[PDB]
Assembly symmetry: D2
Homo-oligomer: 268 residues x 4
């Protein structure tokens, strides 16, 4: 009945009620999934946010740069879902690039310390979470991560786009490892979504030039998309993630599903 | 409950019980869809084959090279499903290339009359069916066609691969037109499936050289696929088509979903 | 000294002094190549046009839809360059799609007779010319064809884009055959060039809607290109074709080189 | 006469006489270029190696992880080529990934410290060198870097492939910056070349499993390539780099040229 009835799914990446992962979690619960949530740093805030989900879910702390958090993660999940139970799904919805790499300054001005932190959080951590959680995943399981199509350079978000190029490559290798467990690994490449951070950047948080370029980027998306694109509505993206978590794409792995209104298939 | 409960879906392309479209139809009916079937030329044979589906379905004749069949198709579908009802889904599972283009002779020996017939049936007809059926499709509907990844040349099936390259391009334009109706258009790129025609070719129907090349092509597929690939089992492909017919990929159009075990994401 | 000193090269596709093939021929002669030209239908006009090239060149008639022209072509070339001499290069600069397929009407209104004629001239003929000329090509030779990136759908030129998708696929198979002769086969994907036909379409030859869409398409190209794009200057495209005809890309075949200002690598 | 007559070109990446950059330098000098070389760490060794080039060239020390080396690089180049002279070309032939990331252990066992060092040297440094050298490059200049097609995952060299995915993305952004100077930026994606490090790995330096997988990877390359692939001969790769350094690909930037025998265009 529900698309994800009886499935146990870990969802990372909630920080506000406009996080893509908040809508992934809401839709997954609507479809019968039992969730375990992970959050970074502001756990009191995240608990208050996730109190608004349709069902209660245990919240675990996870800083993906903390090797001790990752080393203990599987045992804390098993404690939360009960011994003898394993996960059927894992959602990676985690990304960050320090400001020096996202247009507040020229691409050339980002120090490598900043780029390497962003690639750690946004790309390497996808392999990190798979390594931690595959030992407690059931055959037929599914790992899904969030992507923004990096196949062409864009005016702003420069180093973040490089990090997404690395993530797409990491995903293909995670699929190799996950296949030994009977588990699939895929990314959902979403169009632009007006999260709190996104709206701040359009408002000029990283400079007027970066704001104007991203606003024009957003506008062309809805113009290109044959079915349109609503940057204020994350539900179509959440449904696509749930599709990959379900049993209905069983021969897809190492791959990228585009939830972008079809915009990437059109020129003008 | 059922993935496709209450949806009205037209399925083309059944000719034997090993047709990919036979398994698409079976799975769609398992998931609550009400079907209308179309068949080419041997309608008595196709009716006997489809008597084995879990539910009865009206069968309409459709030769996609016959402009009179296409001009009458929408009215015959409306008669079959009842006035005031429209389609929610359309499945194109149609392909053919005369033997001169598929390895029985060198690529250079195929006369254009043969190539143009194959491109008519295998690529142009996707636009033909969309033109005929979009006027009787509901908003939120879905058109799905079958593909075999043509991004690289392969030893055999040469002109058929050229026809698939054309089909992928046709799909992106059909998505533009379908979007005006609130309808999505996508292809499923399947790995090799042992249909009756496929087994005959491996058995040497088009020459020993073509048979040996296709057998080695099949074997590398399961070796590359991180989750494996079973050429004897079309159900994973049928489930993927049903996923695209459902409401769970609502922001994907003009696109290609790979149901190939992940083989196209791996080198060796 | 000259990039193409001593090379014997056949160049198809001249019809006016704004043809891309006119500039290919001019640059090749500047670089020391000895040319044989082929022309379609209006041979008196083409001879008057090519009288303006820096050197005289024999002109042969070639309608690529005429099997008798193709069957005699190799012998007529050998007569023109002398017995015991072979070609080092072949340039395919041929394209056509009847008006019903290029935006004067909706994509769905093109009859297949029109599409099949356009695919014959624009895609199948690349294999046709390779079949005719490979028997009289030297090892180390090069076949080059002209392309317009069809990986995404564009507002107009719809069926012509489908034909380019087919041509890219044909090129990969021609490379397989040409390799047995020690010959490379590649396409140059050019940005928009203001030929006489192009200017007529922008002027509204195929309707005001098609004209406006193509004008906006052209403008975004120069905006995207990191080094800019001058649609009035075919010389950068001609130089790229000469690069592929030379010995300086000796390990590239079945491939596509983009002479588009870098526009296809950028989003906005 | 010479392809690169009068051009001033910096070439990084020589360490042995089997380095790809050694053959790039040799061919560039054969074609009239005046070189400045950069080398990492073992400068006495590199000078003895480059004494075998057809012409003497100044050698400058450059560790791309050393910000002081990069901050002084432009001034040291200007001293070497003379005040009032600028560079016409820059070759990046630099790559490294610590052993934990290249198959001596499972992909999951590479610590991020190792991955981040490899991405620093193999990808970020392409932007680092462009930032340092664009202020002393002439309009019409060219930056070229070395690539190994990372679009699909391969058995070994795992994290190095992720680093190449990042490099391809970096190249598209460097093209944006370089265009303001009238300079192009491109990568050459080479097939496998038997450098000293490559032969050591096939010999089992990183374990027997990694050695066997890379040997089978090499063998399929020559089998796929329509013109063949000779892993013992770097000259076709060097010629392709020289083609991009020349004026004969003037409308290509942000792009990738494949010098791989056509292998990436073929499946089997
Ligand atoms: N336009 C968009 O918003 C958009 C489009 C496509 C893809 N994405 C991707 O979707 C993902 C979710 O981003 P979002 O748009 O929902 O914004 P968001 O700010 O709501 O989510 C980012 C999440 O990353 C988490 N995070 C940051 N550092 C972490 C760390 N060290 N350890 C663990 N978690 C950490 C944040 O706590 C936060 O929960 C990101 O990968 C993003 O790049 C976003
Ligand atoms: N390995 C595979 O079998 C494989 C893999 C990927 C994609 N595909 C694609 O899946 C589609 C279905 O093929 P299949 O493998 O199930 O083989 P199949 O022979 O069972 O189906 C082919 C169908 O095309 C129909 N057809 C032929 N000419 C027609 C015409 N003039 N009008 C209407 N219908 C016509 C046949 O009647 C038949 O029903 C094809 O597009 C095929 O290329 C097949
Ligand atoms: N914007 C552009 O102009 C552009 C951009 C990229 C690629 N191209 C491609 O470059 C090629 C050359 O086109 P062009 O732009 O120089 O326009 P053009 O009109 O000058 O050249 C087209 C050529 O095709 C030839 N041709 C048509 N039918 C033929 C037949 N039956 N047999 C032999 N030749 C025939 C014409 O005679 C003409 O010489 C075409 O393939 C075109 O699609 C053009
Ligand atoms: N099969 C192949 O060999 C192959 C194929 C395609 C691409 N490539 C790429 O070609 C490039 C050249 O590699 P190669 O195959 O000639 O091997 P190589 O070992 O001869 O060259 C590697 C070079 O990187 C340099 N380097 C390492 N660390 C450095 C640092 N901190 N600062 C500056 N330089 C540093 C080395 O000193 C060495 O000169 C690399 O980017 C490689 O990935 C190699
Ligand atoms: O990685 C992202 O989250 C991302 C979001 C974007 C949102 C708007 C425009 C460009 C963007 C590029 C990105 O890499
Ligand atoms: O179009 C197809 O149905 C097709 C099937 C194949 C099946 C096996 C190998 C190659 C194949 C290529 C094709 O284009
Ligand atoms: O094939 C072509 O010649 C072609 C030219 C174009 C020129 C301008 C815009 C779109 C275009 C699409 C094409 O397929
Ligand atoms: O980056 C490289 O140098 C590289 C070389 C290879 C050489 C042989 C096989 C795989 C390889 C993968 C790589 O990323």
């Amino acid at each position: 009945t529900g698309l994800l009835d009886g499935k146990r799914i870990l969802v990372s990446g909630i920080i506000t009620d406009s996080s893509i992962a908040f809508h992934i979690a809401r839709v997954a619960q609507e479809q019968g999934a039992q969730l375990v949530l992970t959050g970074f740093d502001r756990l009191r805030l995240i608990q208050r946010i996730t109190d608004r989900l349709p069902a209660k879910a245990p919240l675990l702390e996870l800083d993906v740069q903390n090797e001790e958090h990752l080393a203990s993660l599987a045992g804390r999940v098993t404690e939360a879902i009960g011994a003898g139970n394993k996960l059927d799904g894992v959602v990676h919805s985690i990304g960050f690039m320090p400001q020096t790499g996202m247009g507040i300054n020229p691409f050339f001005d980002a120090p490598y310390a900043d780029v390497s932190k962003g690639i750690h959080i946004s790309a390497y951590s996808y392999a990190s979470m798979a390594k931690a959680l595959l030992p407690i995943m059931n055959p037929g399981g599914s790992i899904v991560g969030m992507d923004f199509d990096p196949s062409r350079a864009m005016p702003a978000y420069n180093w973040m786009t490089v990090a997404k190029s690395a993530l797409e490559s990491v995903n293909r290798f995670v699929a190799r490892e996950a296949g030994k467990y009977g588990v699939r690994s895929n990314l959902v490449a979403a169009g632009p979504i007006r999260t709190l951070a996104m709206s701040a950047i359009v408002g000029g948080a990283l400079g007027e030039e970066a704001g104007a370029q991203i606003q024009l980027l957003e506008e062309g998306w809805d113009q290109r998309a044959p079915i349109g694109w609503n940057m204020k509505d994350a539900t179509p993206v959440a449904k696509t993630v749930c599709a990959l978590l379900s049993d209905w794409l069983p021969a897809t792995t190492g791959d990228i599903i585009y939830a972008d209104g079809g915009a990437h298939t059109q020129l003008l």
